[PDB]
Amino acid sequence: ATKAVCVLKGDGPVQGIINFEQKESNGPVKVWGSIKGLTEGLHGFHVHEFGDNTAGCTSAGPHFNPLSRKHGGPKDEERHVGDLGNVTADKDGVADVSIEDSVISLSGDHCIIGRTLVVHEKADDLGKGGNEESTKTGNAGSRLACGVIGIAQ
Amino acid sequence: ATKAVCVLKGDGPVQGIINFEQKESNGPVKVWGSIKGLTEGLHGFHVHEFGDNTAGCTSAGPHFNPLSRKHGGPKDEERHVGDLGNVTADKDGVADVSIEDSVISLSGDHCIIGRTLVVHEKADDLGKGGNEESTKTGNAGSRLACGVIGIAQ
Ligand SMILES: [Cu+2]
Ligand SMILES: [Zn+2]
Ligand SMILES: [Zn+2]
Numbered sequence: 001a002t003k004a005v006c007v008l009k010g011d012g013p014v015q016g017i018i019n020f021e022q023k024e025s026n027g028p029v030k031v032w033g034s035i036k037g038l039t040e041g042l043h044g045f046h047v048h049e050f051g052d053n054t055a056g057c058t059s060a061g062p063h064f065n066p067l068s069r070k071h072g073g074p075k076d077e078e079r080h081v082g083d084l085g086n087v088t089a090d091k092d093g094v095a096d097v098s099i100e101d102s103v104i105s106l107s108g109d110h111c112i113i114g115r116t117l118v119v120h121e122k123a124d125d126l127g128k129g130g131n132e133e134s135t136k137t138g139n140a141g142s143r144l145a146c147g148v149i150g151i152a153q
Numbered sequence: 154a155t156k157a158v159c160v161l162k163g164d165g166p167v168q169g170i171i172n173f174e175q176k177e178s179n180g181p182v183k184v185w186g187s188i189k190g191l192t193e194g195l196h197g198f199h200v201h202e203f204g205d206n207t208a209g210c211t212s213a214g215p216h217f218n219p220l221s222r223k224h225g226g227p228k229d230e231e232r233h234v235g236d237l238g239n240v241t242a243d244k245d246g247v248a249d250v251s252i253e254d255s256v257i258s259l260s261g262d263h264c265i266i267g268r269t270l271v272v273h274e275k276a277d278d279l280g281k282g283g284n285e286e287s288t289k290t291g292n293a294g295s296r297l298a299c300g301v302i303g304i305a306q
């Protein structure tokens with residue numbers, strides 16, 4: 001009963017469509033879709049703070065982090081709201097995304113509408129990498145594609 | 154949010170960046186920026202309902218109209234929330250946009266974050282066209298460029 005969508009675009013072409021559905025405001029968000037053009041393996045997948053793509057994906061700023069916590073994986077209590085972990089691409093470069101997440105929302109203060117979804121070059125280390133960057137970004141490298149999350153029918 | 158931004162893109166030469174700022178809750182929204190690639194003259198300018206660009210600008214749906222009103226211009230009481238009138242391009246194809254609007258908002262029920270800004274082929278007739286489409290769409294013709302309105306820093 002609330003729906004959102006994001007068209008991911010980046011050089012490659014890396015491209016995909018990601019859908020979001022939340023049946024009630026107190027429930028989880030289902031995230032699903034497909035991304036093509038990726039190298040085989042895990043790729044970091046995050047909601048970033050700003051829905052600003054004026055200079056490409058860099059303009060999206062840091063991870064969406066309304067509670068000012070450290071970076072983690074989606075299962076961790078200490079995580080950014082935008083920490084959705086990794087997506088996995090197969091040998092053909094396609095990632096079939098299927099996530100349920102209870103921390104993001106399509107309404108209220110953890111709302112991700114109007115923010116940027118980003119898929120990364122490298123895997124997110126989920127804050128377990130033991131360098132400074134691990135608990136900020138997860139070391140997921142460059143931003144390969146992004147889009148602004150919009151309200152859907 | 155107090156600031157928002159939209160990058161307008163389409164299949165042709167029309168592109169631009171539009172900024173939004175609302176200093177006070179329920180206060181006016183300043184709308185400003187530049188659009189290039191346009192034919193000289195007026196071009197309709199609207200917020201459409203969905204932030205869905207999966208098949209380009211057509212996917213954005215109808216005018217944003219939460220109050221179930223007829224189509225009008227920005228200075229009319231009878232208007233859709235998304236009715237921002239026309240932008241004017243010069244011979245070089247550049248429209249410098251500078252609007253203040255108090256019907257749109259960057260929060261609450263009239264919030265435009267996560268919806269689509271669209272610039273059109275033709276002028277919007279502001280509901281004065283005397284055909285049935287005038288009070289629905291304004292007869293502004295094709296959608297030349299669009300983008301999702303995102304949260305800005
Ligand atoms: Cu329009
Ligand atoms: Zn990221
Ligand atoms: Zn993070």
Ligand SMILES: [Zn+2]
Pocket residue numbers: 199216223224225232233235236289290291
């Ligand atoms: Zn209208």
